RNA sequence: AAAUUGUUGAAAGGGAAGGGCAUUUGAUCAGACAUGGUGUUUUGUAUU
RNA sequence: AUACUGCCAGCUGGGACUGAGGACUGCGACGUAAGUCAAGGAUGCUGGCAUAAUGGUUAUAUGCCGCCCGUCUUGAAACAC
RNA sequence: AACUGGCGAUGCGGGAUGAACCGAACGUAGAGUUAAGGUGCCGGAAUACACGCUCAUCAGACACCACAAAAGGUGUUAGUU
RNA sequence: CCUGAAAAUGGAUGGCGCUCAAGCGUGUUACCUAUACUCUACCGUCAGGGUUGAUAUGAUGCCCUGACGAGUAGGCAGGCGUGGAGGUCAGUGACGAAGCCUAGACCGUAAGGUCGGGUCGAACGGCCUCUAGUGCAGAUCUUGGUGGUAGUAGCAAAUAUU
RNA sequence: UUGGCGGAAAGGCCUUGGGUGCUUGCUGGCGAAUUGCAAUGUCAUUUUGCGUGGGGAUAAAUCAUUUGUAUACGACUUAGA
């Protein structure tokens, strides 16, 4: 959602030219981040390995106003509220190992070859 | 079917050579063409000069930087001749064009290597004797190529180094002939003669 | 067990999708014949989708057969299995979707007892 | 339900085939290969190896030997379409060949449970090899270079054109 | 059309290879002497060669014998038409019209 | 010695095609050293294999194969017509093919 | 439910995308030598 | 006693696609007498693999091809709606 | 306006492209031949064979068809008196 | 072959390029490939026929033979699906009906039918028939809901705020 | 290992010395077999790991601040332990 917004050097660190400072969005996310950190503290989590593992903003129902246009016309003047949710988890180690055993199917000629290679080799 | 076929363009017709190479590239033969400046076009120099001026006319009217790009180097003129014989806008055509390299003179990786000719495209085999023809180097210079004089000095260098190797080659081969003359009248050589060798 | 059954590879295994059902959401994929005056599909232009035609019809002695060679009969109860008793090599039972799990066990037991192949003898359980 | 019993019924018993008029006539082998001819194998474990042709077997299959002493190819049987017959011929007179047949190479196939989860030669078979090879070697020595001929595996070389290549 | 004068060889080959009788408005392959005798026996034509004979040497019962034969369904010529363009007269280097004896080569390669 | 070839070097040239319609079920194959139809008759009926590699080992191999046969000759210049068990992918135009010496007649 | 949206995740992308035939590659899946030589040498022997 | 033409129910090879179809019949061929056969449509033998290997689906890539549908109209992809 | 064949109502191969031209009209597949049109490369198919002719400081290059004329040239070739 | 021969964006023997041609006239072959021709399989349609045979096979059943298949406007036929009605399956079902989602499966040329998995909570199907307010992509269609545009146009008259 | 040569894209060529294998130049001994009558029947790199170990010299850009030779914003020109 960056069409025809301004450019800045503070987007260089992200490899963009277009960036902004959404104060109201940042404050709301800060209040949610604080709620999540408080939720983790009451959950006994480490609270120094916590990272934003899930975060998502979708549209809450529109708050509807109206705006007056030329020649006695009315248009919508709508808010686009947000549902925000996020999940903070602490970073862990490798999840698992031991990939597939992959039960092998060889033909008769394949078995004879490796048996011949095995005796040829040492 | 060789891994790379290196053709020298000297005394070759650009169109017929472009046709042969394009077929080889499509069939999977990597090709490099050297001596692009000594390539030939049929017709007098004035004819082929006028034709490139006609090609020079064509350009996008509202922005000349998107129109046809008129490459002046003799290697690029051959490349243009070949790209017209390849479906270059398809992925298969890009792959065939990648298998081709064109050079003026012979850059270092190829003046130690074998050079072949295409009899279908050779000028002394194709053109009727007495018929006027254009050398690519002179044509390219006239339309704005800058490196004819540079190539001539670097080609003179390569040739004179190439002359020493051949005289060395003749030196090494004559020692075989005279030593084989003394190792001659052998039963093995007689037996091979009876057996086709 | 048998002969190498007909319908070897293909007559037309691809779905006949409705034209422009890939273009608009409102156009469902259920086959509809284009009736337009200018339709490239109706006029059979090269490079367009194929329309269903009676020539695609399957061999009569293989038509309606599963890959196993049995025809599938929908069965709602054990009594619906009586018709399949003596034709276990040409028919197979399919337990209807709305049969309870307790009654599904009974139909499975009877079909296995008389050697009736069931097309879906694994519903309502895991392996 | 739709129907208590379908109005039409299929067949219960399995149809019997009718009498096929296809008699199995003997194979007509090509003339290039006669017993004693040096062959070249084109496929299998011994692809490219040179073995002499010994006998035409009952299952349309050539019987050949290296000899095993010469190139490691035992008394074996090959498909006639997977060999190349050459003009080099050693006389097959002196080696008895009447004891070889399809029953000679009876297999005793493996069982399904026998499976290579991780990854012998009969005395008569090897003794038969020692009899055929000594009789066939004894004739190989009459042509010089032939024992060295039979050891070298065949390969195509850059420029070798099989349609023009005479064997 | 292309037409001309067929010899005995091509008529024999036409009837043997592509010979079908019009029987009950149906195109049934000849394939047997009985099939001709059952339909043309009243005219004395009892064998396939009896039918061929009534065609090559135009006999009194040619019309019945010829109409009994279904129209012959030939292939395109095996080696081509021998000309770049069919739809000129044979005399003009085309293919249509009367080629007197050269119909035999064209038909045999089509049959 | 160092040479171990028993097949003939061949190039997959294209599908059988008209100007604008191609038939993938038939492939046109060049045989190395064959420039006339008469020399191509030797290879009629001979087995062909397009040999290619895949990153996933399937049945103890990372090398997969499609088999075929030389069915007839094509044109005047030694190209032959070939059909494969599965048609060739058409990214293999210009790719190498192996024409074997079996089934053999010499 | 759909449109529309945040979007397990996968994939593709040099001036649209989408489609048809064909194969390849990836992913994914249905169908199969389970009881019928002995009327039965083992195997919880009327469970074959 | 021959690069031409015609004919042969003359001969000898090399490739390809197809195998439809019965619980029992027809027309024929071949030896001088157990009957066989290439005669109203494939069998015999031999391997490998009982698994995603073949195949179905779907995504991509590749080759070639593919203008936006409805409508009125002689004529629509239309710079017609 | 006449006769016919077409397009409209029709895809398919060819004429790059195109309602009508050429070829051929269409169930779903396979093999073999072809049509019209082609076979330097794009592009499947002879940079084949044979005899000539033409060099253009705007060559020419295939019906419908996407144009060119009168008049001229010891340019070149053949021919007539 | 050349002159005659002048038009407007850059440009089209289809393009490249071609000069004892890859040009032009002609001859001879070889070769390429259409949904056309030949042959074979399978679908359908139509036509012409056979069949009252045993303690298994409703005769609109079973079977044999041949030909044919383009289609707008339009006609007809056989079917697919929807709401309700009579009859039946002494049908399915809270041990889960209906509905919905599912680049899962099967069947049918198709309309669609069946089924696996998920969600779900009270009804609902098959078959023989009856009946109709019975099938949508369009009507600048109706009502409702929602996009791209787009965090864009903009939120600058009335002196001015700290 | 010693001498050179090669800048067009050299990135590769020739080398004098030692060691070290092989050598089918010629003649022997032993082995191979059952991959079952074919099945590519598998023989040549980019990149990764709290990989292995033998070495190797221990930086900058960007934001922010600043500048006006620059500037709609970005961008630019400067300065700044």
Swiss-Prot record, chain A:
<dbReference type="GO" id="GO:0005737">
    <property type="term" value="C:cytoplasm"/>
</dbReference>
<keyword id="KW-0963">Cytoplasm</keyword>
<feature type="modified residue" description="Phosphothreonine">
    <location>
        <position position="8"/>
    </location>
</feature>
<keyword id="KW-0832">Ubl conjugation</keyword>
<keyword id="KW-0597">Phosphoprotein</keyword>
<keyword id="KW-1017">Isopeptide bond</keyword>
<dbReference type="GO" id="GO:0022625">
    <property type="term" value="C:cytosolic large ribosomal subunit"/>
</dbReference>
<comment type="function">
    <text>Component of the ribosome, a large ribonucleoprotein complex responsible for the synthesis of proteins in the cell. The small ribosomal subunit (SSU) binds messenger RNAs (mRNAs) and translates the encoded message by selecting cognate aminoacyl-transfer RNA (tRNA) molecules. The large subunit (LSU) contains the ribosomal catalytic site termed the peptidyl transferase center (PTC), which catalyzes the formation of peptide bonds, thereby polymerizing the amino acids delivered by tRNAs into a polypeptide chain.</text>
</comment>
<dbReference type="GO" id="GO:0030687">
    <property type="term" value="C:preribosome, large subunit precursor"/>
</dbReference>
<comment type="subunit">
    <text>Component of the large ribosomal subunit (LSU). Mature yeast ribosomes consist of a small (40S) and a large (60S) subunit. The 40S small subunit contains 1 molecule of ribosomal RNA (18S rRNA) and 33 different proteins (encoded by 57 genes). The large 60S subunit contains 3 rRNA molecules (25S, 5.8S and 5S rRNA) and 46 different proteins (encoded by 81 genes). uL22 is associated with the polypeptide exit tunnel.</text>
</comment>
<dbReference type="GO" id="GO:0000448">
    <property type="term" value="P:cleavage in ITS2 between 5.8S rRNA and LSU-rRNA of tricistronic rRNA transcript (SSU-rRNA, 5.8S rRNA, LSU-rRNA)"/>
</dbReference>
<keyword id="KW-0687">Ribonucleoprotein</keyword>
Curated annotation (Swiss-Prot), chain D:
<dbReference type="InterPro" id="IPR041997">
    <property type="entry name" value="Ribosomal_eL6_KOW"/>
</dbReference>
<dbReference type="GO" id="GO:0005829">
    <property type="term" value="C:cytosol"/>
</dbReference>
<keyword id="KW-0597">Phosphoprotein</keyword>
<feature type="region of interest" description="Disordered">
    <location>
        <begin position="1"/>
        <end position="21"/>
    </location>
</feature>
<feature type="modified residue" description="Phosphoserine">
    <location>
        <position position="11"/>
    </location>
</feature>
<keyword id="KW-0832">Ubl conjugation</keyword>
<dbReference type="InterPro" id="IPR049633">
    <property type="entry name" value="Ribosomal_eL6_CS"/>
</dbReference>
<keyword id="KW-0963">Cytoplasm</keyword>
<dbReference type="GO" id="GO:0002181">
    <property type="term" value="P:cytoplasmic translation"/>
</dbReference>
<comment type="subunit">
    <text>Component of the large ribosomal subunit (LSU). Mature yeast ribosomes consist of a small (40S) and a large (60S) subunit. The 40S small subunit contains 1 molecule of ribosomal RNA (18S rRNA) and 33 different proteins (encoded by 57 genes). The large 60S subunit contains 3 rRNA molecules (25S, 5.8S and 5S rRNA) and 46 different proteins (encoded by 81 genes).</text>
</comment>
<dbReference type="Pfam" id="PF01159">
    <property type="entry name" value="Ribosomal_L6e"/>
</dbReference>
<keyword id="KW-0689">Ribosomal protein</keyword>
Curated annotation (Swiss-Prot), chain E:
<protein>
    <recommendedName>
        <fullName>Large ribosomal subunit protein uL30A</fullName>
    </recommendedName>
</protein>
<comment type="function">
    <text>Component of the ribosome, a large ribonucleoprotein complex responsible for the synthesis of proteins in the cell. The small ribosomal subunit (SSU) binds messenger RNAs (mRNAs) and translates the encoded message by selecting cognate aminoacyl-transfer RNA (tRNA) molecules. The large subunit (LSU) contains the ribosomal catalytic site termed the peptidyl transferase center (PTC), which catalyzes the formation of peptide bonds, thereby polymerizing the amino acids delivered by tRNAs into a polypeptide chain.</text>
</comment>
<comment type="similarity">
    <text>Belongs to the universal ribosomal protein uL30 family.</text>
</comment>
<comment type="subunit">
    <text>Component of the large ribosomal subunit (LSU). Mature yeast ribosomes consist of a small (40S) and a large (60S) subunit. The 40S small subunit contains 1 molecule of ribosomal RNA (18S rRNA) and 33 different proteins (encoded by 57 genes). The large 60S subunit contains 3 rRNA molecules (25S, 5.8S and 5S rRNA) and 46 different proteins (encoded by 81 genes).</text>
</comment>
UniProtKB/Swiss-Prot annotation, chain F:
<dbReference type="GO" id="GO:0005829">
    <property type="term" value="C:cytosol"/>
</dbReference>
<dbReference type="Pfam" id="PF01247">
    <property type="entry name" value="Ribosomal_L35Ae"/>
</dbReference>
<dbReference type="GO" id="GO:0000027">
    <property type="term" value="P:ribosomal large subunit assembly"/>
</dbReference>
<dbReference type="GO" id="GO:0006364">
    <property type="term" value="P:rRNA processing"/>
</dbReference>
<dbReference type="GO" id="GO:0002181">
    <property type="term" value="P:cytoplasmic translation"/>
</dbReference>
<comment type="similarity">
    <text>Belongs to the eukaryotic ribosomal protein eL33 family.</text>
</comment>
<keyword id="KW-0832">Ubl conjugation</keyword>
<dbReference type="GO" id="GO:0003735">
    <property type="term" value="F:structural constituent of ribosome"/>
</dbReference>
<dbReference type="GO" id="GO:0022625">
    <property type="term" value="C:cytosolic large ribosomal subunit"/>
</dbReference>
<keyword id="KW-0963">Cytoplasm</keyword>
<dbReference type="InterPro" id="IPR009000">
    <property type="entry name" value="Transl_B-barrel_sf"/>
</dbReference>
<feature type="cross-link" description="Glycyl lysine isopeptide (Lys-Gly) (interchain with G-Cter in ubiquitin)">
    <location>
        <position position="46"/>
    </location>
</feature>
């Amino acid at each position: 959602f960056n069409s025809s917004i301004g450019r800045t050097a503070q987007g260089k660190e992200f490899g963009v030219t277009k960036a902004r400072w959404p104060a109201k969005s940042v404050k709301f996310v800060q209040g949610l981040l604080q709620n999540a950190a408080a939720n983790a503290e009451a959950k006994g989590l480490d609270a120094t390995k916590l990272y934003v593992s899930h975060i998502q903003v979708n549209q809450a129902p529109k708050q509807r106003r109206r705006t007056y246009r030329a020649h006695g016309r009315i248009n919508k003047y709508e808010s686009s509220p947000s549902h925000i949710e996020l999940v903070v988890t602490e970073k862990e180690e490798a999840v698992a190992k031991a990939a597939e055993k992959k039960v092998v199917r060889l033909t008769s000629r394949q078995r004879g070859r490796i048996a011949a290679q095995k005796r040829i080799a040492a | 079917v060789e891994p790379v076929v290196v053709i020298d363009g000297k005394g070759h017709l650009v169109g017929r050579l472009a046709s042969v190479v394009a077929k080889q590239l499509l069939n999977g033969q990597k090709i490099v063409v050297v001596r692009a400046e000594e390539l030939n076009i049929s017709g007098e120099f004035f004819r082929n000069k006028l034709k490139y001026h006609d090609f020079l006319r064509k350009a996008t009217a509202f922005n000349k930087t998107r129109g046809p790009f008129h490459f002046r180097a003799p290697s690029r003129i051959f490349y243009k001749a070949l790209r017209g014989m390849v479906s270059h806008k398809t992925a298969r055509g890009k792959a065939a064009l990648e298998r081709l390299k064109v050079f003026e003179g012979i850059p270092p990786p190829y003046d130690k290597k074998k050079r072949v000719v295409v009899p279908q495209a050779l000028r002394v085999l194709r053109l009727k004797p007495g018929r006027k023809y254009t050398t690519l180097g002179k044509l390219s210079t006239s339309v704005g190529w800058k490196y004819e004089d540079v190539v001539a000095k670097l080609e003179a260098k390569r040739k004179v180094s190439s002359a020493e190797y051949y005289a060395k080659k003749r030196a090494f081969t004559k020692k075989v002939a005279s030593a084989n003359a003394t190792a001659a009248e052998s039963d093995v050589a007689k037996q091979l003669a009876a057996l086709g060798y | 067990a048998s002969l190498p059954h007909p319908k070897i590879v293909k007559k037309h295994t691809k779905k006949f999708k409705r034209h422009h059902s890939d273009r608009y959401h409102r156009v469902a994929e259920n086959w509809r014949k284009q009736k337009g005056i200018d339709s490239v599909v109706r006029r059979r232009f090269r490079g367009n989708i194929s329309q269903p035609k009676i020539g695609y019809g399957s061999n009569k002695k293989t038509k309606f057969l599963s890959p196993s060679g049995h025809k599938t009969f929908l069965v709602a109860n054990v009594k619906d299995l009586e018709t399949l008793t003596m034709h276990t090599k040409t028919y197979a039972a399919e337990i209807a979707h709305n049969i309870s799990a307790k009654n599904r066990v009974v139909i499975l037991a009877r079909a296995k007892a008389l050697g009736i192949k069931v097309t879906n003898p694994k519903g309502r359980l895991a392996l | 339900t739709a129907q208590q019993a379908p109005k039409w019924y299929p067949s219960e018993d399995v149809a019997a085939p009718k009498k096929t008029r296809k008699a199995v006539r003997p194979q007509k082998l090509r003339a290039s290969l006669v017993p004693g001819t040096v062959l070249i194998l084109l496929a299998g474990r011994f692809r490219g190896k040179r073995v002499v042709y010994l006998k035409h077997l009952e299952d349309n299959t050539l019987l050949v030997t290296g000899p095993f002493k010469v190139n490691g190819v035992p008394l074996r049987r090959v498909n006639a379409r997977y060999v190349i017959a050459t003009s080099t011929k050693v006389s097959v007179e002196g080696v008895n060949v009447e004891k070889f047949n399809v029953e000679y190479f009876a297999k005793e196939k493996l069982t399904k449970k026998e499976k290579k989860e991780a990854n012998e030669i009969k005395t008569e078979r090897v003794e038969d090899q020692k009899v055929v090879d000594k009789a066939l070697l004894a004739e190989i020595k009459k042509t010089p270079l032939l024992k060295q001929y039979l050891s070298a595996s065949f390969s195509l070389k850059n420029g070798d054109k099989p349609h023009l290549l005479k064997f | 059309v292309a037409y001309g004068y067929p010899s005995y060889s091509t008529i024999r080959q036409l009837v043997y290879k592509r010979g079908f009788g019009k029987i009950n408005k149906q195109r049934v392959p000849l394939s047997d002497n009985a099939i001709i005798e059952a339909n043309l026996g009243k005219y004395g034509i009892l064998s396939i060669d009896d039918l061929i004979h009534e065609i090559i040497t135009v006999g009194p019962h040619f019309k019945q014998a010829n109409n009994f034969l279904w129209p012959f369904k030939l292939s395109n010529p095996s080696g081509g038409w021998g000309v770049p363009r069919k739809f000129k007269h044979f005399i003009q280097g085309g293919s249509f019209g009367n080629r007197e004896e050269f119909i035999n080569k064209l038909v045999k390669s089509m049959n | 010695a160092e040479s171990h070839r028993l097949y003939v070097k061949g190039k997959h040239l294209s599908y059988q095609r008209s100007k604008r319609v191609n038939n993938p079920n038939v492939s046109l194959i060049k045989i190395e050293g064959v420039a006339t139809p008469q020399d191509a008759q030797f290879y009629l009926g001979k087995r062909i294999a397009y040999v290619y590699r895949a990153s996933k080992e399937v049945r103890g191999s990372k090398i997969r194969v499609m088999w075929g046969k030389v069915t007839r000759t094509h044109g005047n210049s030694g190209v032959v017509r070939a059909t494969f068990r599965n048609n060739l992918p058409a990214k293999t135009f210009g790719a190498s093919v192996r024409i074997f010496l079996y089934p053999s007649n010499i």
